Design a protein around this ligand. Structure first.
Ligand code: HEC
Ligand code: HEC
Ligand code: HEC
Ligand code: HEC
Lengths: 131, 131, 131, 131
């Protein structure tokens, strides 16, 4: 037995929430006093989570609120699995690049790579996440 | 500016929950049909989250339940934290050097070492101590 | 099980105040008649207090005035703290090793590395997480 | 001509209070799980403060409450500088030994050394500190 539908929703939400925190740290470093190690660590989280196979957390029965757990996934997500697949793979590429650039310590290159990742997060949300 | 106490608790819980999911995947691979890439991806999440600086999510209002958010942290946890920030590290280094130089008895070297310590006191105050 | 928030604020203020007195003695020696033993003793206080783990005095509930005790700490200070405890260091080391071993693809080595990580999770929970 | 009487009282109280905190940490380590580095850092504070020349903080108008500042020094202190001398030398010797033993990491040598320091604190208080 795998994760229940409720567990799948909770778990995917956790991964997203934790990526969001790390994105926020990168933004803070870019706008304030840049800490290269801190940005590298944050970028490594985003890449690792992007590569963690979160598609497995969108099993049958996770399209609607379950128990006391509410989901913000739009029903269209499940009917567009081929496109969700494409965007997820694109997000992986962007996240990998952000980690690579972050390891160099170059804030200006990170700023560009950070923007590309942000655009991938946003593209998926526009299509598949309820406001 | 930063995460509210509620957001800090939610975010640390998210990181832990997501590690738990990835640990479970490793266990499943070890007990069943081993998928090397899957285990590698899961292990990378655990390492990235372990290195993500979650100490920043254990701020002063987060020892007790907040709003609708409940925490399971014990108060004993917090005393193991230390300021690992840039200025603190500058200060410790500078203070250690001042003691070393002072042991030599050389006033001119002490004067220089003393100035470096004073600058660290002042720089922390300017940023983190109210006037 | 430790210092109250009020006691923590009082104690950290005491350490800072006492460092201030010793800094003043060093300054006086530099500007007047230099006493090497006196400067060495003062510098030793500054180094010892810098190394004394005052992070343990920045616990939850010490970000604001308590009782009749007033604090001048800014809320921004706290996010720079990290768990430097034994179990955290064991965990990070174990997690890094699990990722390394997982990259080799060798399931028997992963099984061992996975167990070491699991033991670190569990040991922190036993001490610091409510059942 | 230096620290005001109020500043002298405040400063000596700060040094004592901070030593007290560090003594309490050594006691906590002995009553719980022993952390050698933590005990070493605490012992170093006690030795440094013992050696810091706090006699200079017992200037003329500091035998009584001043302004808003209250003191617990007994009048006998100022008229018994020879015995205060003896106890201070017993204390500095004991504190130096505690730091030495603490650096070895040997808890048994520490518990014993800790007791000798505590006896010196207590003997001065009995004679020269108001209950
Ligand atoms: C699809 C391909 C996505 C990508 C890439 C990213 N996100 Fe996402 N996000 C997605 C969905 C379908 C959902 C809803 C999940 C649910 O079941 O409710 C989300 C949700 C979030 C959230 C809110 C999580 C919560 O607290 O409930 C956040 C904060 C979030 N997403 C952030 C985020 C970031 C920072 C991304 C890239 C770095 C990212 N998302 C990518 C779908 C997808
Ligand atoms: C301290 C050094 C810890 C280590 C190492 C790990 N965990 Fe932990 N865990 C810790 C605390 C203090 C808490 C309570 C957090 C709170 O604010 O409530 C937790 C909690 C968890 C949880 C529950 C999260 C939730 O949904 O509320 C899980 C699932 C969890 N921890 C798992 C986990 C795993 C898998 C670890 C190692 C791989 C791990 N923890 C390490 C403290 C610490
Ligand atoms: C951060 C990295 C700091 C360093 C390094 C030093 N100080 Fe500090 N100082 C700091 C804070 C956040 C505060 C406020 C503490 C509070 O809870 O109110 C202080 C305060 C002081 C004070 C006033 C203490 C009082 O009686 O209220 C003094 C006199 C002081 N600091 C001196 C001092 C000296 C001499 C330092 C280096 C040798 C030093 N500080 C370093 C933060 C930090
Ligand atoms: C004389 C030779 C002393 C030795 C040795 C120690 N102490 Fe002391 N202590 C002494 C005096 C005269 C006073 C009163 C000072 C005043 O002006 O009020 C004190 C006070 C303390 C206090 C209370 C300080 C406060 O917050 O107001 C503490 C906590 C304290 N002393 C602790 C202490 C410790 C831990 C010692 C050895 C390790 C120690 N004292 C030695 C005189 C002397």
């Amino acid at each position: 037995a795998g994760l229940s539908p409720e567990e799948q929703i909770e778990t995917r939400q956790a991964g997203y929430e934790f990526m969001g925190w790390n994105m926020g740290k990168i933004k803070a470093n870019l706008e304030g006093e840049y800490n290269a190690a801190q940005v590298e660590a944050a970028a490594n989280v985003i890449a690792a989570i992007a590569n963690s196979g979160m598609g497995a957390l969108y099993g049958p029965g996770t399209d609607k609120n379950v128990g006391d757990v509410k989901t913000r996934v739009k029903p269209e997500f499940f009917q567009n699995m081929e496109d969700v697949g494409k965007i997820a793979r694109e997000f992986v590429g962007a996240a990998n690049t952000l980690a690579e650039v972050a390891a160099t310590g170059e804030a200006e290159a990170v700023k560009t790579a950070f923007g590309d990742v942000g655009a991938a997060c946003k593209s998926c949300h526009e299509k598949y996440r309820a406001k």
